[model samples]
Target: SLISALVRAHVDSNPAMTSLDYSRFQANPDDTQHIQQFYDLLTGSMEIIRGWAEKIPGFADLPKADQDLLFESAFLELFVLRLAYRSNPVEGKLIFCNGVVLHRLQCVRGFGEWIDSIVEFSSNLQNMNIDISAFSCIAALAMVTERHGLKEPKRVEELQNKIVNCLKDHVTFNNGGLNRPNYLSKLLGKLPELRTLCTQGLQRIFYLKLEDLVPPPAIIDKLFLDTLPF
Candidate 1:
């Protein structure tokens, strides 16, 4: 959480200023293009976040496997994190990386049962009323997460601890005061929720893989196995 917070702190995501939020995409909910777009979205989003992660201080210092593990573990969670922050699912509007806006119904064929959860998570986040700085920290907190098989787990843990310290200060101020009722706990609480959402994401992927519903792009295929226990 702390590591992710540091990452988020380092990278300010300004949708207005960034080209990442400028582009858009849509197809028949069931079109081959639709399928391809989904793959492209995840694949592309990971690369973007991966770049951001690399920019994190000391991130490049880690062993390659540890870095890969961190990226894989956090990818889906951060994917949902990015969407939740940037999109409005409550209004049934999903804003993609390229700034493509699609109604919730249009995502039905692609997202299926997972759409409701994704939207619900987004709604809950919207309701949280936390500012972007805090949320970005939370998003980063999600990324510097612990995963199995690390060559430098200790170093990662150290960074996570430091991040937690940073988050405490951010939440303290972001909440206005220690007097803010349960706000700190509530903010801290979001981490587990996001992790659960990522699990749901994995389940969604596994289902897709089983039904051969959408052929995951090669990058996604590799990311999937790395991120999930299956």
Candidate 2:
């Protein structure tokens, strides 16, 4: 799975960024700004995912049962944690809080009771496993917000520019217009799939309907898709 491969590679290669040593990075005054930037990058990434998930074909059309199942999927969790870890470890902690609330709401019968339980359990992390996997799940919620376009466009634009500039510094094209990165080429090679997912997710946001039908005049806008790769 792309998610699995990415997660393993990310953890193995970026020892300084892993959940275990992330605190050290956060604690360093020199690394603090960089860590914050990374967190902002993650925040942008999550916004994109949220946008896609809420607007995507399968997600939009999914029955409540299926939606719940998708939310619980391991891949979704990993995606979430990666984003959260990138943003702020403390924000990642919030993800854990939300997860407990969600689970309790799911297993119990009444909404009132669930709300009461959630209020009571919000601060208790006694048995909670604060692993990367758990963080990933919290990050997946980013998709939810992204799909709704709840985030500010200015922030997204700023991050997009930063990411594009960074990529441009590393990528060069060969004779056939095949692009390659100077460093982390293996990870860069996966950009196509990542781009595709982003595009598709964006399309879903613009067209998906609760009735399982696309809205009229809902063509995928080239401008939005075109700007992504560059």
Candidate 3:
């Protein structure tokens, strides 16, 4: 409930204010009206995110451990956007950016703690040899942080090594194959269906592009969702 409330407040106060057509709102100079509009948009966006998360396949079925892992991955995306906004004040937009998101994660209540918890949970999950794409997805965020020179050089190097090791130990790639879960092999005997599922999950969030900076469809789709998991 707190997470939902915070997200709504953020959406309403930040992007809603920024979205106003300055020519119109500035002419009126009614602060109360502007504030109301901000909260309306913010609550509306929260509903949309909740709906999407519910609809996304496999998300609802995730155990608490896996759910936390996925939350960290999604939170990393938000953190990156926060950092980008702080680093480039003039062009900083709330929609999304790696730099801005990372900055927000550090500053925002609950976010930084959630990331720390996810890291510890993932460390334990790794020992179980379960499907660890969620862990990999979060690790990908660390890679982005390193790319932006946001972390200490030594920490970045360590993260890189950990990611590479995880891939080697958990991922299976072969002819007509891509990244897939290795844990199920002993039980299912190397099923092709599992490989396809793993590949789809990894591909959905693995790569990023300038397109990800676009806003949600409620504002303007910008065709970015077309390229993402949807």
Comparison by lDDT, 1 against 2, better one: 1
Q: Give lDDT tens digits, candidate 2, residues 71-135.
A: 32222233323422333323222222112112322212222232232233332222233344322
Taken over the whole model, the C-alpha lDDT of each candidate is 0.71, 0.31, 0.32
lDDT of 1 at 149: 85
Candidate 1 segments exceeding 4 Å error? 1-14, 17-31
Q: Best lDDT goes to which candidate?
A: 1
Cα displacement (Å) at residue 20, model 3: 12
Q: What local lDDT does model 2 show for residue 173?
A: 28
Give the higher-TM-score candidate: 2 or 3. 3
Q: Lowest lDDT 10-mer window, candidate 1?
A: 14-23
Clashes of 1: 11
Q: What's the TM for model 2? A: 0.22
Model 3 Cα displacement at 74 (Å)?
8.9
Q: 16 in model 1: Cα distance from truth in Å?
A: 1.6
lDDT of residue 2 for candidate 2: 24
